[PDB]
Design an enzyme around this catalytic site. Structure first.
Site, PDB file in Angstrom:
ATOM      1  N   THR A 266       0.839  -1.165   0.000  1.00  0.00           N
ATOM      2  CA  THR A 266       0.000   0.000   0.000  1.00  0.00           C
ATOM      3  C   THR A 266       0.874   1.214   0.000  1.00  0.00           C
ATOM      4  O   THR A 266       0.490   2.257  -0.507  1.00  0.00           O
ATOM      5  CB  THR A 266      -0.894   0.041   1.262  1.00  0.00           C
ATOM      6  OG1 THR A 266      -0.119  -0.318   2.399  1.00  0.00           O
ATOM      7  CG2 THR A 266      -2.038  -0.913   1.137  1.00  0.00           C
ATOM      8  N   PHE A 391      -6.144   4.589   7.044  1.00  0.00           N
ATOM      9  CA  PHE A 391      -5.430   3.597   7.880  1.00  0.00           C
ATOM     10  C   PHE A 391      -6.389   2.864   8.802  1.00  0.00           C
ATOM     11  O   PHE A 391      -5.986   2.290   9.795  1.00  0.00           O
ATOM     12  CB  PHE A 391      -4.307   4.295   8.683  1.00  0.00           C
ATOM     13  CG  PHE A 391      -3.220   4.905   7.816  1.00  0.00           C
ATOM     14  CD1 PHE A 391      -2.269   4.081   7.166  1.00  0.00           C
ATOM     15  CD2 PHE A 391      -3.158   6.282   7.614  1.00  0.00           C
ATOM     16  CE1 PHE A 391      -1.287   4.630   6.355  1.00  0.00           C
ATOM     17  CE2 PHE A 391      -2.178   6.833   6.788  1.00  0.00           C
ATOM     18  CZ  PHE A 391      -1.241   6.009   6.171  1.00  0.00           C
ATOM     19  N   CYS A 398      -4.145   0.690  11.213  1.00  0.00           N
ATOM     20  CA  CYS A 398      -2.836   0.307  10.693  1.00  0.00           C
ATOM     21  C   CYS A 398      -1.739   0.529  11.722  1.00  0.00           C
ATOM     22  O   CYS A 398      -1.472   1.668  12.093  1.00  0.00           O
ATOM     23  CB  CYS A 398      -2.504   1.170   9.500  1.00  0.00           C
ATOM     24  SG  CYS A 398      -0.973   0.674   8.712  1.00  0.00           S
TER      25      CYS A 398
HETATM   26  C1  HEM Z   1       0.060   3.689   2.746  1.00  0.00           C
HETATM   27  C2  HEM Z   1       0.369   2.606   3.418  1.00  0.00           C
HETATM   28  C3  HEM Z   1      -0.625   1.837   4.182  1.00  0.00           C
HETATM   29  C4  HEM Z   1      -1.980   1.930   4.191  1.00  0.00           C
HETATM   30  C5  HEM Z   1      -2.863   2.821   3.276  1.00  0.00           C
HETATM   31  C6  HEM Z   1      -2.431   0.958   5.156  1.00  0.00           C
HETATM   32  C7  HEM Z   1      -3.778   0.748   5.453  1.00  0.00           C
HETATM   33  C8  HEM Z   1      -4.216  -0.110   6.455  1.00  0.00           C
HETATM   34  C9  HEM Z   1      -5.580  -0.360   6.762  1.00  0.00           C
HETATM   35  C10 HEM Z   1      -6.795   0.271   6.111  1.00  0.00           C
HETATM   36  C11 HEM Z   1      -5.616  -1.219   7.801  1.00  0.00           C
HETATM   37  C12 HEM Z   1      -6.920  -1.706   8.461  1.00  0.00           C
HETATM   38  C13 HEM Z   1      -7.325  -3.079   7.921  1.00  0.00           C
HETATM   39  C14 HEM Z   1      -8.721  -3.543   8.389  1.00  0.00           C
HETATM   40  O1  HEM Z   1      -9.431  -2.903   9.212  1.00  0.00           O
HETATM   41  O2  HEM Z   1      -9.143  -4.630   7.935  1.00  0.00           O
HETATM   42  C15 HEM Z   1      -4.255  -1.559   8.139  1.00  0.00           C
HETATM   43  C16 HEM Z   1      -3.891  -2.467   9.098  1.00  0.00           C
HETATM   44  C17 HEM Z   1      -2.588  -2.899   9.265  1.00  0.00           C
HETATM   45  N1  HEM Z   1      -1.489  -2.442   8.628  1.00  0.00           N
HETATM   46 FE1  HEM Z   1      -1.438  -1.065   7.219  1.00  0.00          FE
HETATM   47  N2  HEM Z   1      -1.378   0.391   5.740  1.00  0.00           N
HETATM   48  C18 HEM Z   1      -0.259   0.818   5.189  1.00  0.00           C
HETATM   49  C19 HEM Z   1       1.075   0.483   5.481  1.00  0.00           C
HETATM   50  C20 HEM Z   1       1.457  -0.485   6.368  1.00  0.00           C
HETATM   51  C21 HEM Z   1       2.787  -0.832   6.664  1.00  0.00           C
HETATM   52  C22 HEM Z   1       4.039  -0.144   6.072  1.00  0.00           C
HETATM   53  C23 HEM Z   1       2.727  -1.842   7.610  1.00  0.00           C
HETATM   54  C24 HEM Z   1       3.858  -2.537   8.298  1.00  0.00           C
HETATM   55  C25 HEM Z   1       5.084  -2.082   8.246  1.00  0.00           C
HETATM   56  C26 HEM Z   1       1.347  -2.126   7.854  1.00  0.00           C
HETATM   57  C27 HEM Z   1       0.876  -3.069   8.713  1.00  0.00           C
HETATM   58  C28 HEM Z   1      -0.452  -3.186   9.054  1.00  0.00           C
HETATM   59  C29 HEM Z   1      -0.915  -4.165  10.070  1.00  0.00           C
HETATM   60  C30 HEM Z   1      -0.088  -5.174  10.871  1.00  0.00           C
HETATM   61  C31 HEM Z   1      -2.234  -3.999  10.182  1.00  0.00           C
HETATM   62  C32 HEM Z   1      -3.132  -4.748  11.161  1.00  0.00           C
HETATM   63  C33 HEM Z   1      -3.205  -3.963  12.507  1.00  0.00           C
HETATM   64  C34 HEM Z   1      -4.102  -4.659  13.518  1.00  0.00           C
HETATM   65  O3  HEM Z   1      -5.295  -4.964  13.207  1.00  0.00           O
HETATM   66  O4  HEM Z   1      -3.648  -4.974  14.649  1.00  0.00           O
HETATM   67  N3  HEM Z   1       0.618  -1.243   7.115  1.00  0.00           N
HETATM   68  N4  HEM Z   1      -3.427  -0.883   7.283  1.00  0.00           N
END
Ligand code: HEM
Ligand code: W09
Length: 453
Positions: A266, A391, A398
């Protein structure tokens, strides 16, 4: 009140509407036609798609709704397991990993990752400095090289060496093919039909590849004893303050797989959309380039300099508004409740939040929602609660948000310091969907300003 619903296909209900290679963009079009809420039915299932801040602010009330695993996430779980992204909030391993990992992802934790981010960003700048005059840049391709390599290195002290390759790495070939299978399984009747035996065979083999590499990284690091303080270190040593327990090695594997997918994809989308919007809006590009030149006064950007790139941060937020690269998330009702004073829901009922549509709600943003205007984010606090959600939400938001934004701000700052950009093909936006979103075929030319690293 009869909830609106898009066109149906007899016994298949709405299901064939997602038999397309652009399903999110299709759902956006339906939302334009039907408004803030619509029902979507398939044989044996129903969900509701929300697009207004008015309704989404209710859905984001954690006392009323919790994260649901979409069918997409259930299929991703076959290889991401009970890592953070694909775990239920009530799973012991979610809260443990959350508690253990959260500190290591703070804006402040980025100080420790900054040098390794610069390592990869400099590789990108050098690639582009080394192109000959007639040549061009394949933007999402190079951004994906950058973001994969950055999470690999900062996170696990592993070098994918993506800038040394045309062929993207055996782990990643498998990961990409696994994600692809999961996606296809969505629009696919009778899963146990013999026809898909070959699909299942490949799937299982790709999981094996991903697990072999990562478990080996884990075990090498355990054996070696050598101590970075990186993500993997944190995980091998860290204990959950609540239970007092560490993660087991299997869960650690699942987290690494998750970071490699979550931690890069992403982000490459964001950078690609941001550069797209910059080359389509030359006055914006000029303002951002002025800031980069004024702030980044040393050969190597410092952590503090990146924090000072206010306008570059505004550009990234406005790119996230228009094209949030993880474009939906799913919720379920913890108890019977009424949405919006109008729509009764039972315990367990599901909602999908359509983020690109939320981000086009004219009651929040004004009538000009398609325009790229970073100045909307002059003061990010001015945005109402639950209006801007690239996020996700609450405790399930996120974990990588600050990491992604620090990396994207650093890299975009460096790009704008070091090059002028030309939209030499007058590129027509074409957004490819792989669950996540990217501008397929986006290419530019970059003329060096000849500023030494
Ligand atoms: C522009 C970059 C990114 C966007 C737009 C993004 C977006 C999101 C979104 C929307 C979620 C929520 C998912 C849901 O509710 O089903 C999420 C969760 C998460 N993201 Fe990202 N993300 C990005 C970058 C990253 C990066 C760089 C990492 C790790 C280095 C990461 C790790 C995670 C993890 C582990 C979750 C789960 C958190 C939890 O539920 O405990 N993300 N992200
Ligand atoms: O996977 C699901 O459960 C839902 C809803 C659904 C799928 N099949 C259904 C049948 C009847 C009713 C609903 C459904 N699927 C979708 O909305 C979709 F069209 F596949 C989708 F929008 F592409 C998607 F899968 F939600 C999605 F957007 F790609 C996604 F998977 F949620 C996602 F967003 F991309 C993602 F993968 F979760 C994220 F990128 F990580 F955010």
């Amino acid at each position: 009140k009869e909830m609106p619903q898009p066109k149906t296909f007899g016994e298949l209900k709405n299901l064939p509407l997602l038999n397309t290679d652009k399903p999110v963009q299709a759902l956006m079009k339906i939302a334009d036609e039907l408004g803030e809420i619509f029902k979507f039915e398939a044989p044996g299932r129903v969900t509701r798609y929300l697009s207004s801040q008015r309704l989404i602010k209710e859905a984001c009330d954690e006392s009323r709704f919790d994260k649901n695993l979409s069918q997409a996430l259930k299929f991703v779980r076959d290889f991401a397991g009970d890592g953070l992204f694909t775990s239920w909030t009530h799973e012991k391993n979610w809260k443990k990993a959350h508690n253990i990992l959260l500190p290591s992802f703070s804006q402040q934790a980025m100080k420790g990752y900054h040098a390794m981010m610069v390592d990869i960003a400099v590789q990108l700048v050098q690639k582009w400095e080394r192109l000959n005059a007639d040549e061009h840049i394949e933007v999402p391709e190079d951004m994906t090289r950058l973001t994969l390599d950055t999470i690999g290195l900062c996170g696990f002290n592993y070098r994918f060496n993506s800038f040394y390759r045309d062929q993207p790495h055996p782990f990643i070939t498998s990961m990409v093919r696994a994600l692809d299978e999961a996606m296809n399984k969505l629009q696919r009747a009778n899963p146990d039909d013999p026809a898909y035996d070959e699909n299942k065979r490949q799937f299982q083999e790709d999981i094996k590849v991903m697990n072999d590499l990562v478990d080996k990284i884990i075990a090498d690091r355990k054996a070696s004893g050598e101590q970075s303080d990186d993500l993997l270190t944190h995980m091998l040593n860290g204990k959950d303050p609540e239970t007092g327990e560490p993660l087991d090695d299997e869960n650690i594997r699942y987290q690494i797989i998750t970071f490699l997918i979550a931690g890069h994809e992403t982000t490459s989308g964001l950078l690609s959309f941001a550069l797209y919007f910059l080359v389509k809006n030359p006055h914006v590009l000029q303002k951002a380039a002025e800031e980069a030149a004024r702030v980044l006064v040393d050969p190597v950007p410092s952590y503090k300099q990146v924090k000072q790139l206010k306008y570059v941060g505004m550009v990234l937020n406005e790119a996230l508004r228009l094209w949030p690269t993880a474009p939906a998330f799913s919720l379920y009702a913890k108890e019977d409740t009424v949405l919006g004073g109008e729509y009764p829901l039972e315990k367990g009922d599901e909602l999908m939040v359509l983020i690109p549509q939320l981000h086009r709600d004219k009651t929040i943003w004004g009538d000009d929602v398609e325009e790229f205007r970073p100045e909307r984010f002059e003061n990010p606090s001015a945005i109402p609660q639950h209006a801007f959600k690239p996020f996700g939400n609450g405790q399930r938001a996120c974990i990588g948000q600050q990491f992604a934004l620090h990396e994207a701000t650093l890299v975009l700052g460096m790009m704008l310091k070091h090059f002028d950009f030309e939209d030499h093909t007058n590129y027509e936006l074409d957004i490819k969907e792989t669950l996540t979103l990217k501008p397929e075929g986006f290419v530019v030319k970059a003329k060096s300003k000849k500023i030494p690293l």
